[PDB]
Write a protein that binds this ligand. Structure first.
Ligand SMILES: N[C@@]1(C(=O)O)CO[C@H]2[C@H](C(=O)O)[C@H]21
Ligand SMILES: N[C@@]1(C(=O)O)CO[C@H]2[C@H](C(=O)O)[C@H]21
Ligand SMILES: [Ca+2]
Ligand SMILES: [Ca+2]
Ligand SMILES: [Ca+2]
Ligand SMILES: [Ca+2]
Lengths: 744, 744
């Protein structure tokens, strides 16, 4: 019963969410101050200007039949029948400036298409409405949501927010808007933590309940809101009750409205919102601010709008009529243009230009309506003129940013968006443009005020440490686990790690492998150094015995050579092992063995036996023909358990050394039964005892087969022990005779 | 232009998908033989019977205004205006038997609610239509999809199909139907592998493309189809081109139709479909089979239906008029009732009963229409009579299975479903009822024919081995990993495993821990057994020395006791270690030490020194006062690397044993300078040599600190060596005198 009707040659219908959707009991609730009245006056402002100028339908006066949708599709369909009552076969509306809600526009488009009434819809961004095979009389001055979904996944990719949660309003704007976003999120490798839907249906969860589900997954600290204006207002309220806090990535449903966050700015602080690219209509705000509840009689809802805006009473709102000041008026202090005001004016002018071009075609003789337009053809108006319209946007400077009002082949606008940030200015909140999106996002990250004073991170799992690997479970991208690889495996990639080569450390960066260092007994071996001094001390004792003198002299020379060789071999064996000098250590054992053979040969005329005694020993075969070992190469000793432990192992296993030296160890048995021959009796007893000590030492080294570093000292101990026996026993008769008896 | 109109006092509207949806060019395609014509004739059959009998509106003749929806909401809205043309303020349809598609029913309900025309809709199962605040003049003889979603998650829970993929038609039946299923899947811990949508919109992927996405995740071998009849027909076709194969869990959209799988039965074999609980109307098939294209003149689509059903030409379909046999007719050979035929008859009768009760109220005097029904009140008809209707279902035996046609408070039916299985009968495919769902599913699993001849498994990850653990990543239930726990940790639960106690094996089931067995040298030690025989052999030699005889006799007794004790201690030490007998091993070392002290005391009048010699040694303090060890308890030797290796370690560390026995080892040094005293000279030399051998043996045991099993044999070797020295040296003079000289 409440409507706007203005007489005119051609009448344009208009659907505006003038009053916000009511509760369950009341179909129509409070008034929509920004998105229901400013837009309504924008249509009225455009129609006044269209009739004012003489270049757009000068001979035709444009009338209006504007209704209210109450933000409900069912209510919108109820009112929309007035546009079609006179159109039955039996005001003859030429066109309809479509609804401001995707559900409302879709509902009314399904009806108007039957009667061939073209519909231009500002602010309706559902991607379903671009299906021209179903809505064949529908065009919009705003882009679809197929582009807004791109502008979100790009923002969620610029900041590596790969683990996000989605909340979407029920209907067509939210269901299809979030359906395209999850498609654009999959391409950019973004994982949806959880997807929820809110609305007034019984299936939908409560706003507190959906808030809990967002909090259940604390890793995803950003949520994307493809929600309507009322749901966005209420969801932020539900986050105030729980006192939660997220980073809000919002759509044009939220947009750049201060009223959504009114009172709950604490949780909505640092929000990222995607408003369509638009500019204020400067001529419009002059028209709007001049309005008063006394002259705007043509607008029925304006009287109620005046009361609600200023919280005063015109006649009986506060049981009286004195609260509303007579001098009070709309000004820049309390008024800010709705973002989609240009898209309403362009929508109205698109209809006028379509008729104006058609009028110049069907009625060229007269500027007024001719007989061809007594009955109007909707299909001709839409397909030929409206769908191919092209003009400079009125009331906008021709700076190129205003661009054109052209529709594309789908009857849609250009996909350009702005990015806003909710910031606090000394206790006052506002939206600041922090980027845009024409085809690639360009964000001014330095000016963004974040919710927690730092760039939010929304990742399913934390990055893995350099010592840690990760793997992809089937169907997941953003979620992994951090398994630390064992200190011997190495990382070819973060996806898999496996062992290096034997005796090969996996470097420090762990992405490569390098051979483990070889270990050998250095000069730090005090015990080995101490035996070396003892071996040198034994040589000094032999030299003292030699210095004392000056039977046969062959025994003295042979005994001296063996003892010195045994002492010298200990120092040589304690040196740094090498593959070239591997045979020297093997030869070192033979040098002591040759000395032992000489003692047996000497103990067993006299001048002749000396030549056959040393020669009989073999002389170690001239050191195996001047000698590099029995095994041509020296092996790096590596255990199955690496543990950063590698030993230098010569080719010889230290097993055949008991054969070459064992030749001189068998003559002691023949001297075991030897007796008398005095004073040669004492010499034989010492030699037998000396051979006994050598046998015990050999089993000790054989027992210590493992622990080469420890077993290495066994050879030094055996070498020192052998020298003591040879020097103590063989040199003992000389010490007790030459030194013991001063006669010599 | 094609419609059915029958004159009557009250006219009922009817929307049926008589012709299947056409391609892009053609709005209306082929005829819907089962779900568009059988239902249409079912409504006509009911109206004939309602006017036939005299107990349901006897004084009122029921007319019909039946239209075709072409299976499109936009086309359905176009036709539905004929029900409302006469209802403007300026046939006066009393009620509408609603559409067969949720999108169609929702679209037409939004229009009829404005003019207060009650709508009864068979076959429309969208859960959105139960929102009586939005569709306040809508009732259905079929349950909502809120119950069908339960019947799926229950089936997907009966068989542990926790990893499933969902395909849903675009619109209201599929979008809301799968929205409720995923809610019922979350409660029953079911993970959705992937959710995909199909349709004729441009956003939707192709049927081949969505088939590929199903194949991308081969773990989920079962998919749930909340899809319409045409999409289910086409999706199965797309699986034939790829020659894929899944297990199909389907909704009433698929239902029990043979036509969906016509030609692609190979991939659709072993399907699980959820058809609403229904019974054939026996009186109806009699009416249907009697129809011929010559008498059913009231049905315009019937002539086209006759041609398409039998692939013949009536007038010019095949460019001639001879293919259609005159004698050909519908019979049981080629005809099977549509499942939702009773729900159509009940829908028609629900309208008749609502008017009949209203007629008995407003016009009780006459059976005909009175002045109160010249203008009909829709709200009174719906709220008071229709919404509270209750009657026995006509043409159905009163067996209780027919039940009542009552609507609940939401204007819906009872949520009872049947479960069908697609099976092959000798090369012929058919659906077999393999269960039902009233409130709990009752499936006959033995009769189910599965797709791959075995029960399908749809799990995200395979079950973990008993040696393997698993963990839950955030937000996942059905997906895990199988990490094999190391052989020393144990499973408190499958979620976490950690180490057992030191020296405690984690049992065999791995869910517990038991102490590792203790290891000790058993009788298998041949070397230890061999030294025992040698030790016994040494005792025999001493006994032979004693038997030879029969200065002073104290030395012979003291020497014999020490040698026998040394040999005996080796056998005692080689026994099984115990904590009670720990001191015996410590005492065993002292027994040899006491013997060594006796030799020093004897070697160092004669009768008097014997008492002070053995007493001077201390006698091991009477075995430490009859002795169970220095450490009160015996420790189980455990090394940080368990490796199923535990050793029995006595409290004594084998370090103080060199002190008690060392008392008898110091007297040898005093005898080192001893000489002469002949024949006591030989005894002293042997004792000094014997002490020397003991010193070398002690370092060998000290070196072998580790390897207790190996180091254990060191004590046996040392014990045997000590006995040889004592017997060889101390007993040597007696052997060479008593045995060597036959005079004694
Ligand atoms: N994006 C909306 C749409 O339906 O297209 C939903 O929220 C409302 C905004 C507006 O009214 O300007 C639209
Ligand atoms: N479940 C359906 C619905 O829209 O409610 C969708 O597929 C069609 C079945 C029918 O026509 O009997 C319905
Ligand atoms: Ca609206
Ligand atoms: Ca909407
Ligand atoms: Ca239909
Ligand atoms: Ca549907």
């Amino acid at each position: 019963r409440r409507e706007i009707k203005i007489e005119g040659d051609l009448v344009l219908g208009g659907l505006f969410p003038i009053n916000e959707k009511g509760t369950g009991t009341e179909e129509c609730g409070r008034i929509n101050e920004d998105r229901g009245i400013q837009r309504l006056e924008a249509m009225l402002f455009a129609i006044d200007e269209i009739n004012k100028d003489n270049y757009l339908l000068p001979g035709v006066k444009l009338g209006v039949h504007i209704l209210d949708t109450c933000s409900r599709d069912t209510y919108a369909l109820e009112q929309s029948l007035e546009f079609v009552r006179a159109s039955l076969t039996k005001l003859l509306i030429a066109g309809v400036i479509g609804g401001s809600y995707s559900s409302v526009s879709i509902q009314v488009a399904n009806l108007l298409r039957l009667f061939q009434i073209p519909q231009i819809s500002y602010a309706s961004t559902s991607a379903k409405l671009s299906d021209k095979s179903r809505y064949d009389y529908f065009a919009r001055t705003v882009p679809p949501d197929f582009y807004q979904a791109k502008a979100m996944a790009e923002i969620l990719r610029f900041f590596n927010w790969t683990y996000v949660s989605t909340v979407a309003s029920e209907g067509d704007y939210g269901e299809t808007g979030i359906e395209a976003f999850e498609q654009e999120a999959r391409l950019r490798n973004i994982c949806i933590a959880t997807a929820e839907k809110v609305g007034r249906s019984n299936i939908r969860k409560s706003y507190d309940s959906v808030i809990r589900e967002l909090l259940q997954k604390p890793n995803a600290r950003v949520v994307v809101l493809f929600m309507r204006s009322d749901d966005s207002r209420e969801l932020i309220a539900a986050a105030n009750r729980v006192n939660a806090s997220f980073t809000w990535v919002a759509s044009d449903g939220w947009g750049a409205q201060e009223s959504i966050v009114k009172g709950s700015e604490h949780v909505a602080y640092g929000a990222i919102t995607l408003e369509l690219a638009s500019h204020p209509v400067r001529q419009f705000d002059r028209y709007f601010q001049s309005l008063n509840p006394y002259n705007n009689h043509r607008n029925p809802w304006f009287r109620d709008f005046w009361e609600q805006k200023f919280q005063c009473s015109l006649q009986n709102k506060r049981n009286h009529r004195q609260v509303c000041d007579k001098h009070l008026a709309i000004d820049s202090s309390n008024y800010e243009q709705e973002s989609k005001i240009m898209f309403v004016v362009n929508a109205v002018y698109a209809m006028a230009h379509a008729l104006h071009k058609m009028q110049r075609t069907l009625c060229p003789n007269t500027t007024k309506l001719c007989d061809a337009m007594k009955i109007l053809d909707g299909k001709k108006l839409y397909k030929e003129y409206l769908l191919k319209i092209n003009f400079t946007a009125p009331f906008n400077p021709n700076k190129g940013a205003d661009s054109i009002v052209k529709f594309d082949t789908f009857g849609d606008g250009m996909g350009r968006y702005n990015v806003f940030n909710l910031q606090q200015t000394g206790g006052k909140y506002s939206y600041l443009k922090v980027g845009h999106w024409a085809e690639t996002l360009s964000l001014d990250v330095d000016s963004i005020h974040w919710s927690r004073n730092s760039v939010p991170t929304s990742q399913c799992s934390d990055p893995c440490a350099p010592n840690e690997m990760k793997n992809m479970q089937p169907g997941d991208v953003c979620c992994w686990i951090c398994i630390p690889c064992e200190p011997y495996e190495y990382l070819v990639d973060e996806f898999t790690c496996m062992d290096c080569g034997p005796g090969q450390w996996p470097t420090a960066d762990l992405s490569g492998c390098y051979n483990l260092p070889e270990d050998y007994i250095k000069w730090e071996d005090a015990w080995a150094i101490g035996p070396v001094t003892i071996a040198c001390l034994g040589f000094l004792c032999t030299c003292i015995v030699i210095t004392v003198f000056i039977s046969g002299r062959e025994l003295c020379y042979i005994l001296l050579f063996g003892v010195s060789l045994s002492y010298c071999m200990t120092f040589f064996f304690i040196a740094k092992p090498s593959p070239v000098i591997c045979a020297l250590r093997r030869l070192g054992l033979g040098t002591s063995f040759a000395i032992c053979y000489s003692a047996l040969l000497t103990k067993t005329k006299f001048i002749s036996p000396s030549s056959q005694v040393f020669i009989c020993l073999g002389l170690i075969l001239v050191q195996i023909v001047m000698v590099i070992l029995e095994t041509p190469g020296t092996r790096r000793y590596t255990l199955p358990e690496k543990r950063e432990t590698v030993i230098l192992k010569c080719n010889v296993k230290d097993s055949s050394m008991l054969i070459s030296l064992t030749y001189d160890v068998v003559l002691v048995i023949l001297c075991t039964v030897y007796a008398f021959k005095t004073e040669a009796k004492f010499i034989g007893f010492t030699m037998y005892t000396t051979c006994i000590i050598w046998l015990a030492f050999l089993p000790i080294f054989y027992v210590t087969s493992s622990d080469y570093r420890v077993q290495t000292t066994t050879m030094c101990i055996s070498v020192s022990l052998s020298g003591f026996v040879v020097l103590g026993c063989l040199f003992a008769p000389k010490v007790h005779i030459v030194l013991f008896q001063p006669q010599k």
